[PDB]
Structure formats: structure tokens, C-alpha cells
Amino acid sequence: PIQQLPMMKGMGKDFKNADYIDYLPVNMLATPKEILNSSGYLRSFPGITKRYDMNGVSRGVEYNTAQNAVYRVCGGKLYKGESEVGDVAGSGRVSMAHGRTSQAVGVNGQLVEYRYDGTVKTVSNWPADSGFTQYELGSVRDITRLRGRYAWSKDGTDSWFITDLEDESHPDRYSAQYRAESQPDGIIGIGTWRDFIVCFGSSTIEYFSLTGATTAGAALYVAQPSLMVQKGIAGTYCKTPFADSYAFISHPATGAPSVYIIGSGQASPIATASIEKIIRSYTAEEMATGVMETLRFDSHELLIIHLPRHVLVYDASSSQNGPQWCVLKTGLYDDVYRGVDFMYEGNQITCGDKSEAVVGQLQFDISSQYDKQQEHLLFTPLFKADNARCFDLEVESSTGVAQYADRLFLSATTDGINYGREQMIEQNEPFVYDKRVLWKRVGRIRRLIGFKLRVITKSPVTLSGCQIRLE
Amino acid sequence: PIQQLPMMKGMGKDFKNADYIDYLPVNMLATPKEILNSSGYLRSFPGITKRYDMNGVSRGVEYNTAQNAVYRVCGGKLYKGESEVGDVAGSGRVSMAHGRTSQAVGVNGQLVEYRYDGTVKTVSNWPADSGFTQYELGSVRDITRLRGRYAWSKDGTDSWFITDLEDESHPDRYSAQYRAESQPDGIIGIGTWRDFIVCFGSSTIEYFSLTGATTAGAALYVAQPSLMVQKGIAGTYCKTPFADSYAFISHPATGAPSVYIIGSGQASPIATASIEKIIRSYTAEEMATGVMETLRFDSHELLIIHLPRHVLVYDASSSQNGPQWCVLKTGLYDDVYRGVDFMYEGNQITCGDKSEAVVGQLQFDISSQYDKQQEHLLFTPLFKADNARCFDLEVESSTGVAQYADRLFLSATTDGINYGREQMIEQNEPFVYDKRVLWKRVGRIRRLIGFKLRVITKSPVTLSGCQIRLE
Amino acid sequence: PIQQLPMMKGMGKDFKNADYIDYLPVNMLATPKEILNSSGYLRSFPGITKRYDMNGVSRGVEYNTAQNAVYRVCGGKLYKGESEVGDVAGSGRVSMAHGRTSQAVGVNGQLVEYRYDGTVKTVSNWPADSGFTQYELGSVRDITRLRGRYAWSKDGTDSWFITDLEDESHPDRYSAQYRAESQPDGIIGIGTWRDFIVCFGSSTIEYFSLTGATTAGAALYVAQPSLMVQKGIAGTYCKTPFADSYAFISHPATGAPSVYIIGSGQASPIATASIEKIIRSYTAEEMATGVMETLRFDSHELLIIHLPRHVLVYDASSSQNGPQWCVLKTGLYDDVYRGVDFMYEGNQITCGDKSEAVVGQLQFDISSQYDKQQEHLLFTPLFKADNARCFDLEVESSTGVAQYADRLFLSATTDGINYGREQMIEQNEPFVYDKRVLWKRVGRIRRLIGFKLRVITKSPVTLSGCQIRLE
Amino acid sequence: PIQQLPMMKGMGKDFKNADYIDYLPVNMLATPKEILNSSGYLRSFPGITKRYDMNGVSRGVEYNTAQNAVYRVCGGKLYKGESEVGDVAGSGRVSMAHGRTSQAVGVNGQLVEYRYDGTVKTVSNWPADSGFTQYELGSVRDITRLRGRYAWSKDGTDSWFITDLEDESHPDRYSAQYRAESQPDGIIGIGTWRDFIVCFGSSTIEYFSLTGATTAGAALYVAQPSLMVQKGIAGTYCKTPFADSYAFISHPATGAPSVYIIGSGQASPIATASIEKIIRSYTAEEMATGVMETLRFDSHELLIIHLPRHVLVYDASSSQNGPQWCVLKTGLYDDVYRGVDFMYEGNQITCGDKSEAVVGQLQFDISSQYDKQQEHLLFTPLFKADNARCFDLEVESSTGVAQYADRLFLSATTDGINYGREQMIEQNEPFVYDKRVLWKRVGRIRRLIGFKLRVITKSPVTLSGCQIRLE
């Protein structure tokens, strides 16, 4: 009796409250693909190699379509590709946008626009000598671009302003200010969906479209409430354009936070119970500091969430059985993944660094992050096999590329929390394309059994078809 | 052969009229998840531990997003989070709402607005010195906030008034009064769905939307009869926003009451026959005093209904086989649950109280309510097993987190009403994570059998995979 | 135990990064059709036979529906059918359009019209002697014709222009210039979908429809934000009208490139993981030069993509079990397919070339390309058949038509990368319609096996129903 | 083992290029009906009996609904029923339409209207004396009727004209000219769908609807952009209203030709690979002259296509397993079918002729065509049954009506191209209604086998339930 044991998502116990949680694979992505008796394998997340040296840590990224180039806010500078372009003050995540003639950064309550010629302007109210209207331009929270205009949200005042058409450095001459107003308050995030300006408050999401009215003083944008979503975002960067709408993290004004994808007037959950427990473990502070990103490679459509202790990745392409949430980490003791600000340009994916003044290029035939080996985990769900002796635990591993004959630590838990001794069995060998990763004699299963299957490598780990002989 | 006994929802006979009623789990919530040969388990409701001491029993709660904090009315005082920020009259349940400028409370037929600057105002007619209209303001029943306007309902006269845009303490200058008028009577409750003011009468629910009219005296709301729901609500607090619309308890004006949810112009019942009987056991009084509310955590989307003698919790996330109701109680003798007015703030769910001037914070590690142990029940449906001779009653109980090796009273019934002897079996023990809760020799089924499985603990109870060996 | 081995798509490993990839048939198209316990066969791509001598390598092709002919810009000359009708500058791929009065070619930023009466004009601004507007006509990127207007995109400036209705040599008198305006940049290509002008930038695709305005100065086209797709195309020639919309290769401005088909406001991916890896192997240069075409014959709806080192054909009529991709090549050492710019005229399909000044006509009873024998490759997915001996490896081939008894090399791999001994079996014989191609004794699968099944011929190859006896 | 062999569609090989092709039944229609263990039978196409003697071969047919009679243009005269009502000069197929006052024929580039009072008029420009508009009424290609107006096209110009409402012999006084205009060219055919004038060009099909405008000079018809099909037609007679939309043969401008049905802005292919190969067997000419028509009898929904060498019938009522194409022919040696221009009147279906100056009436109780015996084929798909030793080939035939005991040539192929020895089994008998057509001993299958089952009679042939015994 040969039984296949899935490894795309484990199952275990929480020793702090005795609940049943899922074990998420670490540094691995599930690729659904019929290889041999498997219908899907697991691939190690690609490794990072140093590419450029920047001024400091990474603070923002954006693919400027106008110049067809990637802009990075790394430290106290601003970069077009490799070359520095300007100086940016501040010490954290800064919003980014770009238009026909400039690249704008929202930072320090300011909208600072670096023009391609070399001059740096700042958004300010029109000079008083003009007869043009004046507004209380407070602190800039989030900026975005639509139809040749910069749209930015005032810090916690439910109001957003659009810049002038023929002067991006000043608001519109006559009508520039708009209110969401279908709510008590909140303007935490701003973005552009398709042709609507989307304003994510707390417990509300609003859509604004152009009126087309040309008379002076008339409002150009009109709120569309037929698209109103009754849920807000946790922080300014807890929003992202994922598939055809926005994936966001919900705000505690509407119950426990979760991860959602905007539909058509409604938001649908993406998080699982374990993911929601992970999110609830954070406070509203350090919940508001979370970041969200996307990648697209090898038909992998990944959405990443960075939180001060966990980097979670949700693969939209491998969730036919339910959401497939994996974890990313650096080192061997659950540190936070250093990669952040992933942008694909040319034919390479590049990322910033959370701790060092470098920029890496996410190479594929390795698994080490900046020449440092990493740790991969693959947990098997618990199952009841009372009084069953087990033998011949096999895993089909794609071998051949390795700088060393890397081993694997196999161990088995009998309660879901506590694991037994780790046996070392080789799973890769340099230029050996047939390896047969196998353990002959596993023990007897008293009540429960689950397997850990840990790997430490500098090389890619491809694993599929974990099978067991239960007799 | 082995047979798996469901525990989420049992069967029994009601001896008042010899009917077939349902037995609902007490203090247990059904969490649907494939653990091992189970596809779902049952977990104790999180315990309540003391957080704050207040002036009296809770009377109303809201999440002021303008001040991003939980506002609570305990006793005669008003609290913004923890600190007292006002005083409230009366002793019954009060309505709550909030806006940019103030936090409004509906109490004693008045709309009392506590402004954030420290001034307490009350909604009243404009002074006769104005050139503005005088409306016949009656007693305020329910209030809501929308688009920077407080909308309140006159007492039992079908009429509802909206406040003025720039003076919130007075009705609108020219058009502040509106009527349902597709009805003989009823303004029992008022709410805001998406941007529609929703007026719940008895035997009707009406939707009003902003007209956009600008001329003086023109109506600022128009009824949308395409969305009318032909069913009312029993009391003023017999409705809450559940999924994307409201869930309410229907009025005796449209047949026997039960729990409904607005669809799109229609209502779909949620209560099963047993919940319907429980509701029918109350008069129109003690039903108009019911208080509904919502809660959400770990994907659990609970709708909680407090009546004078019951607390019924409907889990929408685990209703794949039909509506899943459970009973919440305090003590060992079906005394009504003490927690009330749950709101999620920061990263914790805080709840008021019904009998003492305390506020608790819903700890998940424990199951005791203010250091008091609680009785948990789990009934198994009756089945016909003539001459079966059962053996090996097993339950997979998640153990490990406990303060004492708490036991479990297992008992069996043969007619569905009276239960036999209770045997104590250790269902848990501190710091052991492999227990095998099991009773070897169950009796012989003559005609019918059912099981009770009662637990009294200060620690969480997690039960799954109930099975028997029927031979 | 007779087992059937699918041929339409094999499986192997990429030894560079040790990841599982698909193996696609070389010069073989899968036709789904019930034949003999198979339901589908594999037929070689039609051969190319000399038709015409042209000026040089082909640069563009179109079907003049006005003249009911085929216009081919080969080398520096322009040919209507076989006879030269004009002279063309430049050396790269040129845009082509045609109308009731002329045939326009976009080349070197110019819109040169060759009219049917023997006159050559160039699109240019109106003479200043008139009062008609002078636009900033820059460099023409890509051109099209719709509703009696030549519309062309200005290179690198997000703007496009339409010619006048009464003189195709000049832009419109008053309203000739339009802008996408929903994007910081990108005007990579233009086209006509049904009656909309489609503008493909990077990260956006916009649709314009005629307003019907009559007065001067009013815009004659308005955008359609309802039909806009949030995805750009990589290159100017990376789009082709496939089924009822355009299939295109996306832009690095939206992540990794891949092949899409437009639906209604969204693009449905068509490439698989192996195709995406193949595309990513190129850079933005050598990606912006990929040329896409559409063929149609014998219920085959092919989409052909020419890249510097890959000619990938997607068969939309045989993609029931997932996308069906194959590869076309010339020679025996993975050189690129030489045919390009396929067009159906009369009852024959003609093709240009990439290396010689020739034009061929795609005969159906040969597989040779210009009297040169070609290499045809099939593949079988790896399967795990431990300790199993293979016998009677039989393949069904429709023989009879050949000028030689062509042989077939059969070989097997045990790891997916390195293939072993190649045995030659006579797979065809002239004027013999019953051959029974099979290999009696195959070896013993220790762990894995996969078969190569390579054919070199100057005659058509048909194969289906590969089966083994596994015992 | 008794195996049932389908007969409605065989399989074989094409010895020209060794490709698998369908074998379509000849002179046989597949009627889906549960007879007995068969669920469908095959009935010979009804024979033609002489009805009338006319001037020459038929050049047109129509059902004048105003006159309630069939108008046939045969030879050099126009016939109403069996009577002569005018002269038409020409040789090719003519277009026909009719109205309250006339029967119009498009012939020799002229719209000749034969009025029911006996006067022959011709559509031409208004006499110059009146102030009405003068148009460039060139040659006439396709004509039709709508709302009492004759609509015809101009040869190879994209323009088409409607006649005046009151004087049909002249175009409309003020607005009579319109253009398809959404295409470089193509006005190949005209027709009327429901209230829309349909213009089928090459590469586009356009729909025009009445505006109802009243002021002089205002356009009466406006294009409908939502109903446009991006597919052309090959010839002017390669279209016909089939069920509720148009059936047509595509043009070379949009790929290889195939048979399509108009949906809603899209065309759904109806031809198979074999039919498409047959279609490209012809040139652009010899396909421009194909004539499509429709037949409706016995719940049979036939779409008939006449070409120089084929007559293909697609039955839409018997296409539950894909398209059901069959072939009609005259004589015994693939001579093309002689019947043409079918029209049902009274209780009889009447057809003209392709070679003779006669008209027949499709008698159902015979299969002879003008008292000439006809040949019916019924091929069976190839199947592999290596070493089968088949016996007991039984065909269920409905006998009884015949003038002679017509026999049956049964033969078997072993390679799909070449058929072997033919045996004569007596298939019918006069007034014997219970026959059991059966052949006891059939051979031993080496690799492949298929059957021919050819019949030559003058009486109807009904064959169903072909079964064999394999052992």
C-alpha cells in the first residue's frame, strides 16, 4: 500500500493555545504541473545575487513607463537604473508616481517632482498674486497619476487634490479638491484602477471618474458609488494592483484584518485561518507598516506581504484547492526575507535590500541570498495511521545542478508540535541527474505521524511525489 | 465496523409537545478544516478576561473611525477607548453614530452629540428668528450617519429627519423630513447600507438615495422602490450589517418571526426550525428587546443574537451543510451569556458586560469567563441501531494547554430526552500533546442511542473525529 | 499490459537550472481527430517549394482587398502578386496598410502611399498657404487604415493622427491628432479591431470609436475606457488579430512577458511555463523584434511567433488539454525557420523568407524546405515505471507517399536530458500503404524512461498511437 | 463479441499526400432516430421525376409570396409555375427578388422588373427633367427587397442603392446611395436578414437599419456596429439564409475558405477538415461560382453547396456528433448532381436542372434521377483489430418497395485507400418486408479493416444497425 503524502501545505498544532494551524512551506513555491504520478512539484525560491551598490536601504521602486526604465529610492538618493538622479529626504517607504515630464515622489508630507532635465520642483499652492483658487494643502500621504495629473491625498483629512494640467507643480487652477464623503472619514490609500481614481479609506473604498465638464469651477471627478466596497486598508502600502483589481489588507475598523481581492462592489477573502492568526499576532502598529508587492514569472503570479516578522507569499496560479500561502525568510532562524521592491526589467527581476545598501538581481539557478546558503522546509499533514509500520519513504527530486552533495534532514512528529531525530540523506549531487532520495525504514505510527523534510542548500531544490509504503 | 458520529449538530425530542428538535452545541463553534479523517472540528468560544472597570453595564458601542477608537456607553458615562469623555442619561440600550465633528448618541428620545472639542449639543429645531423651516420633531428612536449628515427616526410616525450640512445640531434648512409612505406605519430602525438610507418598518424595508437636488425645498432623498424588501424587524436593535447587507429578525406583522438576510430586493431565511421555535417561545416583548451584533475572527463570521433567555450564534463560514447555530451561556445552568457588544480594536476583541461594570478582552488561550469555569456540550444525533453493541467511543481531542487534568462527562440517552449515567474521562492534561480520549466499552443499543459529551473547563476544548465501533 | 504514450507534448529537465520543462514537437502539428484508439494524430508541417524570385528578404505582406491581390515588400521593391509596382526604402520590417485609392507603407517614419495609377505620394502636413492646422507630425511608428482613413502613430509621443477624408496625403483639416492620455507613455502599435482604433502602448491598450461630430475642431474619435485592457505589447510587431481580437506579447512594464488574447476588457494568457521561459530567455532587445502572424488551414488556426532563435506556433484548434505549442525549424541543428509572412491567395499559401531573395508556396505533400530534407521531432513524457520491461513499442504511421524509404531514429532517456542509443527503423516506403512501424525489444525501466522518436525526411510524416507493452 | 459499426461517416487515407480524410456517405442522409439497437438510420436521397419542360438549364428560383407561386428562370425565359411570363437574356445565375408590384431579376448588370400587369421596366436614373438627384448607377451585382424598396449593389465599388418608395423603377429621389465603408473594399453580395440590409463584402459583413428620418436628403439607413462580422464571402451566390441567420462560404482574404454560420457579430465554422480540403481543391474561381441553397423536409435541415465537381449537403438536424456532411452525385462515376434550385410548393419539392431543359419534383418513394439508377455508398471507419477473424456482417434494411431485387456490393479495405474483392448480397426484394441482409463469413483482420457497402438501385435504400461478430 503506497500512499502519496502531499507537501504543498502541512498541518500542525499551536502549542500556545492548542489549535490546529497550517504549516506553510518555507522558501518554496508550488508549481502545478503533471510530472510523473504527481500533478505538481515544489521549486525553491530563486536566489539573490548582488548587482548594484546603492546609497542605503531600499525605500521605493517603480517602472517608469515614460523613460522605459526602473526608478529606485534607495537611501538618500534616487536612481534611474544604476545612475543617481536626485536626493530624497526621509527614512522610510516613500510613495512613487510618474508622468509625461517628471517622476514624482511622495515623501515627508510633500510631493517632490524630479524632472528628467534635472530640476526638482515641489507641489505648492498657486502664488497669491494670481486670482486662482487657494486650498489648504496639508501633508501629502499618498500620490498617484491619472490622465496627465497627479492625485494626492491629504494626511488624514478625507480630501484629495489633482494637480494642474499645464503645471504639474501646482494644483488645478479652479477645481482641484475632492472629498470621498461617503463615510465618517479615512483616506489612507490612493491609486488608479482602470480609469477611476480609487481612494481607500478605512471601512470604505471609493471610485472617482471624470465628469467631462469644462466650465470653470465645475468638478472634473464624480464619485461612483455603484462600485463602493465596504472595507478599508490597514496602511498606505497595504494595497496593490494584483490581477485586474486591488488586493489589500483590511483595517480593524471592520473586524479582524484579513487579505482581500476587490471584486465588483465586493471584496473576497484570500487569507486562510492560519494567515489570519498570523496577521492578528501583529498590532495595529506594525500592521500599518506592512508592504505588499507582486511578481510574475514562470506563470507564477505571486503576491507578497511584508510584515516586521513574516514575509508571506500567495501564489494565485496554484490555488485550485484553496489559497496556497508560503513563507520567505533569510538564514536558519526565521529572520525576515531581505528581498523587497521586486521589479522586472529587461529580462531580469531585481530587488532592493531590507538591511544593506545593495540591489540584487534574483538569479534562478541558485538558492543562496548574496552567496549565503538558505534553509527550505516542506511539512506533511498529520494523519491517523494507528499501528501501521512504515517503509520506503521516497521523494522525486530533480538533481544535477549543485556545488555540493547537499543533504536533507528528515524527521517525524507524533503530536504535531514536537519532532524526533533528524536523519541526513542526500538530495542533490553535482552533475548526477538520478539520485533516488529515499529512506528505507521509518518506524511504526502509534497514533499520528508527520514529516519535516528540511533542506539547507546553495542550489535549487526541486521536489515532488513524496510517497510512503504503509503496508 | 467503524462509524463516524457528527458532533456539530445533534437531534433530540422536545417533551413539551413530543416534537423533534435540534440540539445545538453549547459554547462550541464548528471550525471546518480537514484535520485527519474529519473535515472539521469544534473549538470552545474564547474566554473573557478582565480589561477595564466602568460605571455600569454596557449600553452601546461603536468604532469611531474619525477618532480611530472604540466608543462605549457603560452605565451613565461615555468612554472613548478607556478615558471618560462624557455622561449619558437613562439606563436602556442607546443608539450610536459618529461623524467628522462629533460622536452622536441616541438616548431618551434625543440625539446628543458630544463634539471632539468638549461641547455637548442636542438636536433641536432652528430658532424662530431664522428664515428657516420648523419641523415637528418627535422622539428619536434610531440614528445613523451618511455623507456628513445625521439621519434620525421620529418615534412611531414613519418620519425621518436629516440634519443640516454646516450646522449638525439642527435639521436641514428646507428639506429635512421624509416618509416611507408605502406602508401604514413603521420606522422601527434606520441604517445605512452602501449609500442608501435603509428604513426598517414592520413588514417593509425602504431604500433612499441622494437626489442631488440643489434648489431650495427640493427633496434630498428619493426612495428606490426597485430594492424594497417586504419584511420588517421586531425591535429597534433586531438588525446588523452581516455580509454585504443587513441581517434582521422579522416582525410578527409578517408571520412567525425568524432570522433573515437581505438579498437583492428579497429576504432569505437563515434560521432553522429549532431556532424558529426558540424565537417563537418569546412574546412581542422580550423579542423587541433582542440585540443582534456581529463578530469576525479566524474566518469565523459569527452573527450573535441576545434575547432575555438565550444567546444564539450563527456561523456563516461553516454553513456548508445548512445553517450552523450554537448556544452561548454562562455558568453550568443555562444562564444567559454575560459578554455583549463585541468590537475589534488594535489586535484584540473587547466586549462589554450585562451584569457587572466590567469590560473584558476575549482571550483565546483560555475559556474561562472572568476566572470562572464554563460548561461545554456536544450532542450527537440519534440513530437507529437495533442490537448493535457499541464499543470504542473515541474522540480526537487537542490537548496540552490546561491548568488541571480536566475531565469530560460522557453519557448516553435512549429516548432523546433523559440521559443515563455520566462517566468521567480525562479529555485533557497539562503539557501533554498525545492523549487518546477513549471509552472502551459502551453498552448495547436496544432501539436508539445518542451521546452527550459534556466538558467543564478553565481551558480550551478542541474536539474532532468522534467515532464508534458498531460491530 | 499495453499502455499508450502521448506524443503531443513531452517532458524533460533543463540542465542549466534543473527544472522540469516541456518538450515541444519540432515541425509537427497535432490534429485532434478520432483515428484508431487514439483520438488525434501528428502531421508534419507543410513543405516550402519555390514560387518567385524577389528583390531580397521579405519585409512585409498584406492582402489588398481593393485589388484582390497580395502585396509583398521584399527587399527594397514592392510587389503586387509577382510584378513590381514601386520602390521602398529602408531594410527592416515595414508597416503595411491599404485602402480604396492606394497601398500605404510605413517606413523610416514616413507614410509612403503607392497609388494604383502609378503615383507615389508621402503623407505630410498641409501647405501653409491654407488656414488648416499645422500639426507636429513626427516619426511614424505603425500605421493602419479604417473607414477611409490612414491612421498612424507618432513614434515615442503617445499621439496618433488620421488623414483627411478627401485627401489621403495630408492629415485631417481640423481634428487629426489624438492622444491616449491614460498612460505616462507608450504608443508601440496601432490597429483596428472591429470599428474601434486600438492603440497598444506599454502597460495599456485603448480603444477609440467615432463620435460622428460634424463641426470643425471637434474630435472625430473618443476613447473607450470600458474596453481598455491594462497590458502593453513588447514590440511594434508583437500583435496579430487572432480569433476575434488581437493576440499579443505583453510588455516588461507589467512583469514577465507572455502571450495573451484579448477578451472583453481582459487578456487571457495563452503561453505555458515553458513558453514563458523561452520568451524570458531574450532581452527587451530581440524581444521588441519578435514578429507575430496568423495562419489558417484545415481547421488549423495557427499563431506563429518569430523570435531571433525560436519560431513558436500555437494551435488554438488543438488546445483542449491545455495550450498546444510546437516549434518550427530549418535544418538539423535548431536553426530558425526561414519562412515568414504567410498569406493565402487563391488556393495556395505563399511565404516570404529570412535569408534568400525567394518566395515559396507551401506544398502539402512534402516536408522539405526548398528541396532540403528537414528534421521532425516528437517526444514522450517521462513516466516512473520501476523494474518494468518494455516490449513491442509500436507507432501508427500513414505511409505510402515518399520518394525514399525514410528511416526514424528511436532513442530513450532515463533522466530527461541525455539520450542513449539511436536505433533506425524504416518508417516509410514509397507506394506502400501498410508498414506497421514498431520495435520489438526495448530495455528495462529502472526508474524513468522517455522516448525521442526523431524523423528526417523529404516527404510528409504522419504518426499517432505510440504504445508499449509493459508486462 | 458483437460490435456495432457506425456508417454515417467513414475514415480513410488520401493517396495524394497520405493524410487522413473523412469518407462522406454518397446520396445517403443520416436520420437520427431510435429504431432498434441502432439509434439512427440512413435513407437514400429522394429521386427526381420529370415535371416540366422548360427553355434551358435553370438560372434562378424564388418563391414569390405576393403572388404565392414559384418563379423559375430557366434558359432564356422567366417562368411563373409552369407558365411563361417574360424573357431574360444571359447565361449565368441571376439574382431574384419580388414585391407587391413586380418580380425583379438582377441579370447582365441590370435590375429588370417584370410587373404583374405585363410591363417590363428597368431600374435607371431619374429623367433629367425632374429636379431629383442623379446617381452613378453602374452595373448591378446583387439585389434584394426590403420594405417595398429594391436594394442592389454596384460592382466592386462598396456602394449600393435603394429604389424610390413610390416609383420602384428609379432610385430614391434624395437619398438612395449608401456605402459599407468599414472596409477597403467588398460588396460581393446583398441580402436582408430580419429588418437589416446585410452587405457581405470580402473581409466584412455589414448590417444597415432604417432611421425613419423624414426630412429630404436625410440618410434612411445607418450601419449597425454591434452586429458586424469580420468575415467575407467568396462569391455572390456563396450565401443563403439557413436557419435564422446566414450561412456562407468565406473569402480567401481572411484565410483559407470554410463554411460558416453567422452568430451575433461572429461566425461559427461548420465545415470539417475534410470539407475544407475539398474547398481548397478549387481555385479562387470555381469557388466564386459555387451556389449555396437550403432544403427543409422531414425535419431535415439541409444546406446544399454546388461546386463544379462536388455537391455537399450539411444536415443540421443530425449533427449531435459534429458536422454531418454528405455528398450528392449523378450516375455511377462521380458525375456531379444534376438537381439544382430546390423550392417547396404545395406539397412537393421542385428542382430545376444543371444540364437539361427540364424540371423535376423529388419523388420520395424512388431513388432514380429521371429514371436513371443511382449509386449509394456507405463507408465504415477504419479500426485496428489485429488477428480478429470477423464474422456475421449484418445490416438492418427496410425492404419491400422495389422493382427488382437490387443487390449490394460489399468489400473491405485493409489500408484505407485500396478496396478489395466485392461480393453481391441481395439487399432488397419487391414486396418482401422482412429480409435479413447478412454476410456470414468475413475474413481475418491483419492490422486494419474498413468496409464499403455500395448500392445501385432505382428504389429507396434504408440501412441501419451495421454489426459484426469479432470473436
* Three-state secondary structure readout of A8-61: CCCCEEECCCCEEECCCCECEEEECCCCCCCCCEEEECCEECEEEECCCCEEEE
8 Å CB contact of B65 and A252: no
Question: Grid coordinates 548574496 are at which residue?
Answer: A370
Question: Grid coordinates 527503423 are at which residue?
Answer: C425
One-letter amino acid at C116 equals Y
In chain C, what residues touch A31 (CB-CB under 8 Å)? Answer: 273
Residue A77: left (phi > 0), alpha (psi -120 to 50), or beta?
beta
Chain D window 264-303: which residues touch C at a Cβ cutoff of 8 Å? 265-266, 269, 271-273, 276-277, 280-284
In chain A, what residues touch C20 (CB-CB under 8 Å)? Answer: 33, 35, 41, 398, 462
* Short-list A134, A127, A162, CA closest to A148: A162
**Paired residues of A352 in beta bridges:** A340
Q: How far D47 CA sits from the closest chain C CA (Å)?
A: 33
In chain A, what residues touch B214 (CB-CB under 8 Å)? Answer: none
Distance, CA of C269 to CA of A320 (rounded, Å): 17
8 Å CB contact of C417 and A398: no
Q: Which three cell numbers stand for residue C250?
A: 505583453
Q: Residue D428: helix, strand or coil by DSSP?
A: coil
Q: Residue D215: helix, strand or coil by DSSP?
A: coil
8 Å CB contact of C145 and D184: yes
Q: Are C207 and A90 in contact (CB under 8 A)?
A: no
8 Å CB contact of C18 and A462: yes
In chain B, what residues touch A252 (CB-CB under 8 Å)? Answer: 344-347
Q: Are A207 and A193 in contact (CB under 8 A)?
A: yes
- Three-state SS letters, chain B: CEEECCCCCEEEEECCCCEEEEECCECEEEECCCCCCCCCEEEECCEECEEEECCCCEEEEEEECCCCEEEEEECCEEEECCEEEEECCCCCCCEEEECCCEEEEEECCEEEEEECCCCEEECCCCCCCCCCCCCCCCCEEEEEECCCCEEEEECCCCEEEEECCCCCCCECCCCCEEECCCCCCCCCEEEECCCCEEEECCCCEEEEEECCCCCCCCCCEEECHHHCECCCCCCCCCEEECCCCEEEECCCECECCCEEEECCCCEEECCCHHHHHHHHCCCCCCCCCCEEEEEEECCEEEEEEEECCEEEEEECCCCECECCEEECEECCCCEECCCCCCEEECCEEEECCCCCCEEECCECCCCCECCCCEEEECCCCCEECCCCCCEEEEEEECCECCCCCCEEEECEECCCCCECCCEEEECCCECCCCCCEEECCCCCCCCEEEECCEEEECCCCEEEEEEEECC
Pairing, β C246-249 against β C239-241: antiparallel
8 Å CB contact of B399 and A18: yes
The answer to whether residue A98 neighbours chain C at the CB level (below 8 Å) is: yes
Q: How far C196 CA sits from the closest chain A CA (Å)?
A: 18
End-to-end CA separation in angstroms for chain D: 5
In chain D, what residues touch C29 (CB-CB under 8 Å)? Answer: none
Q: How far C283 CA sits from the closest chain A CA (Å)?
A: 5
Distance, CA of D80 to CA of D116 (rounded, Å): 11
Q: How far D265 CA sits from the closest chain C CA (Å)?
A: 10
**Paired residues of C102 in beta bridges:** C115
8 Å CB contact of B35 and A20: yes
Run of H or E including D276 = helix D273-280
Sorted by sequence, the CB contacts under 8 Å of residue D274 that are 6+ apart come out as D21, D22, D24, D325
The answer to whether residue A148 neighbours chain C at the CB level (below 8 Å) is: yes
User: Hey, how many other C-beta atoms are within 10 angstroms of the C-beta on B53?
Assistant: 10
* Short-list D146, D163, A434, D239, CA closest to C15: A434
Q: Which three cell numbers stand for residue B238?
A: 433586531
Whether chains B and C touch (3+ CB pairs under 8 A) is answered by no
Whether chains D and C touch (3+ CB pairs under 8 A) is answered by yes
* Short-list C229, C221, C177, CA closest to C203: C229
Chain A window 391-430: which residues touch B at a Cβ cutoff of 8 Å? 414-418
The answer to whether residue C372 neighbours chain D at the CB level (below 8 Å) is: no
Q: How far B244 CA sits from the closest chain A CA (Å)?
A: 8
Q: How far C37 CA sits from the closest chain A CA (Å)?
A: 23
Chain A interface disruption, residue of C183, C229, C259, most A CBs within 10 A: C183
Separate counts of helices (H) and strands (E) for chain C: 1, 44
8 Å CB contact of C18 and A298: no
Contacting subunits of B (3+ beta carbon pairs below 8 A) = A
Buried b (16+ CB within 10 A) or exposed e, B401-415: bbeeebbbbbebbbe
8 Å CB contact of C194 and D228: yes
Q: How many CB pairs under 8 A join C and D?
A: 122
Chain C interface disruption, residue of A63, A65, A300, most C CBs within 10 A: A65
In chain B, what residues touch A20 (CB-CB under 8 Å)? Answer: 31, 33, 35, 41, 398, 462
The answer to whether residue C10 neighbours chain A at the CB level (below 8 Å) is: no
Q: Which three cell numbers stand for residue B372?
A: 470562572
Question: Grid coordinates 505583453 are at which residue?
Answer: C250
Buried b (16+ CB within 10 A) or exposed e, A266-287: ebebbbbbbbbbbbbebebeeb
The answer to whether residue B65 neighbours chain A at the CB level (below 8 Å) is: yes
Q: Are B444 and B388 in contact (CB under 8 A)?
A: yes
* Short-list B272, B257, B245, CA closest to B203: B257
Q: Residue D133: helix, strand or coil by DSSP?
A: coil
Q: Which three cell numbers stand for residue A376?
A: 527550505
Sorted by sequence, the CB contacts under 8 Å of residue B227 that are 6+ apart come out as B196, B207, B264, B265
In this complex, the residue of D184, D225, D256 whose CB is nearest that of residue C99 is D184
Distance, CA of C177 to CA of C171 (rounded, Å): 8
Distance, CA of A260 to CA of A241 (rounded, Å): 12
Pairing, β B412-413 against β C10-14: unpaired
Distance, CA of A150 to CA of A172 (rounded, Å): 10
Question: Grid coordinates 451575433 are at which residue?
Answer: D264
Distance, CA of A261 to CA of A267 (rounded, Å): 6
Distance, CA of A391 to CA of A442 (rounded, Å): 5
Q: How far B142 CA sits from the closest chain A CA (Å)?
A: 18
In chain B, what residues touch A414 (CB-CB under 8 Å)? Answer: 434
User: How distant is the alpha carbon of residue A235 from its chain centre?
Assistant: 14
8 Å CB contact of A296 and C185: no
In chain A, what residues touch C323 (CB-CB under 8 Å)? Answer: none
In chain C, what residues touch D381 (CB-CB under 8 Å)? Answer: 34
8 Å CB contact of A255 and B296: yes
In chain A, what residues touch B436 (CB-CB under 8 Å)? Answer: 447
Q: Residue C50: helix, strand or coil by DSSP?
A: strand
Sorted by sequence, the CB contacts under 8 Å of residue B339 that are 6+ apart come out as B48, B328, B351, B352, B353, B354, B360, B362, B369
Q: Residue C252: helix, strand or coil by DSSP?
A: helix
8 Å CB contact of B462 and A273: no
User: Hey, how many other C-beta atoms are within 10 angstroms of the C-beta on D440?
Assistant: 9
Residue D121: left (phi > 0), alpha (psi -120 to 50), or beta?
beta
Rounded-to-5 percentages of helix, strand, coil across chain D: 5, 45, 50
Q: How far A69 CA sits from the closest chain C CA (Å)?
A: 9
Contacting subunits of D (3+ beta carbon pairs below 8 A) = C
Distance, CA of C352 to CA of C349 (rounded, Å): 10
